Amino acid sequence: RSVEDDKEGHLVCRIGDWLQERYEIVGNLGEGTFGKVVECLDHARGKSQVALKIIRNVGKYREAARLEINVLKKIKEKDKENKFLCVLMSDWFNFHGHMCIAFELLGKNTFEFLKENNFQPYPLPHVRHMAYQLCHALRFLHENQLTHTDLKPENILFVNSEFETLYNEHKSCEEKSVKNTSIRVADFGSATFDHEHHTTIVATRHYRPPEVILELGWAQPCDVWSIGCILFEYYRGFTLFQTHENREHLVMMEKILGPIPSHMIHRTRKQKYFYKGGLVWDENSSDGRYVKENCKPLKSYMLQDSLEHVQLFDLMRRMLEFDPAQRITLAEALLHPFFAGLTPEERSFH
Ligand SMILES: Nc1nc(Nc2ccc(S(N)(=O)=O)cc2)nn1C(=S)Nc1c(F)cccc1F
Ligand SMILES: [Cl-]
Ligand SMILES: [Cl-]
Ligand SMILES: [Cl-]
């Protein structure tokens, strides 16, 4: 059987196809610039269901995937009972130049669920449970000297994304409400140990913290900022920072969170963003006018005034502190009174 690649180096495969006389493809899960993700049955392990990430036959992707595999091995080694909520690898192999990584099959990611729910946001009890698990998952990675650097809703999966369809009487429309809010953290390809080389830029732009934009260096607090942006997005169903460029991003940060601390401004070599100790930007530009119209103080985005909403917003604001040294740690976050509302099942991790 000839193995075939398309023009971009993606493996040509379809439902029905097999790999290593072992993994039978039974579905398509998704795709990206890295290649594709298929659902397989693993005939060597009782037909167990797997998500198999199939990387393009392109050197720079094969190399990144090899690094991801190495990261995953180290993580598994530190969490042998798979207790700390990560999507860990069951197998990996090089298939005619395509690196393939097999993972236990979970449900949809939290972005895809949001999207299939027409971007209607998660209810607060759901946001609260998800935030709790995220703080705990990352706290454990952080305590093992690791930073994720690429947290975003697409990288957070429901263990099971089965939902109930409920009629929202205030909206005159149906809503999908996930039956179980247990989640797992995925995509460790960019994860960086304390002692390893730190690239100047990390994170997906919408989830990238100011110390990274200002090239001030970064560590574990990077992940805390990203979690704050994620929690906003779960709660409102739209992205906190919908931006494509650094200068606009910083202006959004200022409108939503207040001024950038002067000490950060004085320390950055990125002085092109500043003029006279202050952000410089064209208020009359397409980006200028978009930000002035759409970006408001964080507190203004609260849907309700009850105590649990106030506590969410207090927590989010502490996650979104400009100075990574002042930013709440996840150890501290887990002590926040926002988490008093967890059911005992949610708190003990069921
Ligand atoms: N372990 C695992 N299970 C799943 N399941 C899944 C994926 C997509 C969908 S879909 N097609 O969006 O409804 C449903 C279930 N995905 N998955 C993984 S590791 N996805 C994944 C990811 F979440 C981030 C980067 C690469 C990936 F391959
Ligand atoms: Cl490319
Ligand atoms: Cl191995
Ligand atoms: Cl200005």
Side-chain angles (χ1 to χ4, degrees), residues 1-6 8-20 22-30 32-75 77-79 82 84-139 141-161 163-173 175-275 277-298 300-349:
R1 272 220 171 272
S2 301
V3 178
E4 295 288 351
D5 285 353
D6 72 20
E8 286 186 322
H10 292 77
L11 178 65
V12 181
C13 53
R14 310 267 193 261
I15 301 176
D17 292 344
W18 284 63
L19 291 89
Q20 300 194 327
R22 180 180 172 175
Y23 292 109
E24 180 195 356
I25 302 176
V26 294
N28 287 297
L29 293 177
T33 59
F34 62 81
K36 88 176 167 159
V37 189
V38 299
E39 179 185 333
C40 292
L41 298 185
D42 177 354
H43 292 256
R45 299 281 181 278
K47 283 178 184 159
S48 73
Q49 298 175 336
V50 281
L52 184 79
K53 178 182 197 186
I54 305 179
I55 310 281
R56 296 156 71 176
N57 189 10
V58 171
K60 86 169 186 286
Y61 291 99
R62 179 162 54 251
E63 283 319 293
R66 278 173 179 160
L67 288 167
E68 178 182 356
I69 291 158
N70 287 344
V71 170
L72 286 163
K73 291 198 285 181
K74 284 164 177 187
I75 293 160
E77 184 187 333
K78 297 178 174 195
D79 181 20
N82 203 322
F84 300 93
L85 316 189
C86 296
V87 182
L88 269 27
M89 166 181 81
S90 64
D91 195 17
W92 67 271
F93 52 92
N94 182 333
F95 181 75
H96 301 88
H98 304 276
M99 299 309 297
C100 302
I101 312 169
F103 302 91
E104 190 183 24
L105 182 71
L106 299 175
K108 290 186 191 291
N109 70 57
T110 58
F111 169 73
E112 267 301 305
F113 192 97
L114 185 60
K115 180 175 181 186
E116 295 303 304
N117 199 40
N118 198 35
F119 297 96
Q120 301 311 292
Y122 295 97
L124 195 150
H126 294 203
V127 178
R128 180 172 51 221
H129 187 209
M130 290 186 270
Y132 177 67
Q133 298 175 83
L134 287 171
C135 294
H136 169 87
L138 273 302
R139 160 88 212 96
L141 296 162
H142 291 179
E143 70 193 344
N144 287 280
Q145 295 183 12
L146 192 63
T147 299
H148 188 292
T149 81
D150 196 33
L151 296 166
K152 47 186 184 189
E154 288 163 308
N155 290 340
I156 303 309
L157 312 182
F158 290 111
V159 174
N160 188 318
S161 51
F163 56 88
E164 295 209 324
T165 304
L166 308 164
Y167 190 76
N168 180 308
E169 299 182 359
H170 294 142
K171 285 178 195 169
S172 308
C173 71
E175 259 166 359
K176 308 178 189 170
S177 166
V178 84
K179 284 178 186 177
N180 191 301
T181 49
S182 304
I183 55 165
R184 300 290 184 262
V185 171
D187 205 35
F188 295 87
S190 305
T192 302
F193 285 95
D194 290 3
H195 283 90
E196 289 171 342
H197 171 69
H198 282 45
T199 65
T200 294
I201 306 301
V202 290
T204 291
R205 193 183 307 271
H206 297 169
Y207 309 90
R208 182 173 306 153
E211 64 272 17
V212 171
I213 295 164
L214 298 181
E215 308 190 355
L216 294 179
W218 55 267
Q220 283 79 10
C222 183
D223 282 346
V224 183
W225 179 279
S226 299
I227 291 161
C229 296
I230 290 160
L231 295 186
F232 182 93
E233 200 171 329
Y234 289 169
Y235 181 78
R236 291 307 309 258
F238 56 79
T239 296
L240 180 59
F241 300 109
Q242 183 70 42
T243 182
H244 58 298
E245 70 139 58
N246 279 332
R247 185 181 302 271
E248 185 184 60
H249 198 171
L250 295 162
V251 173
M252 300 182 161
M253 286 183 187
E254 291 219 337
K255 293 203 177 287
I256 293 173
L257 302 172
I260 295 153
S262 59
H263 68 267
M264 288 172 84
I265 300 178
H266 297 173
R267 287 262 272 203
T268 187
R269 291 267 316 269
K270 311 300 288 188
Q271 289 302 313
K272 66 168 152 170
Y273 302 121
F274 303 100
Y275 184 68
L279 265 181
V280 78
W281 56 291
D282 184 346
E283 292 178 42
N284 201 48
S285 71
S286 267
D287 289 358
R289 290 298 168 197
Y290 175 77
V291 163
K292 294 170 64 77
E293 187 57 41
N294 292 276
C295 298
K296 309 285 165 54
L298 180 66
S300 77
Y301 293 99
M302 299 184 70
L303 296 163
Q304 305 292 346
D305 294 4
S306 63
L307 176 51
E308 61 189 1
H309 293 258
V310 168
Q311 293 169 331
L312 170 61
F313 274 74
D314 176 83
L315 179 62
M316 285 198 299
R317 190 199 89 255
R318 290 174 185 256
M319 302 175 159
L320 300 168
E321 293 286 357
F322 282 100
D323 186 338
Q326 303 285 344
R327 198 165 306 145
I328 200 177
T329 65
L330 294 186
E332 298 157 351
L334 287 161
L335 302 175
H336 199 276
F338 178 51
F339 296 123
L342 295 162
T343 65
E345 293 93 340
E346 295 174 341
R347 197 178 277 102
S348 64
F349 302 97

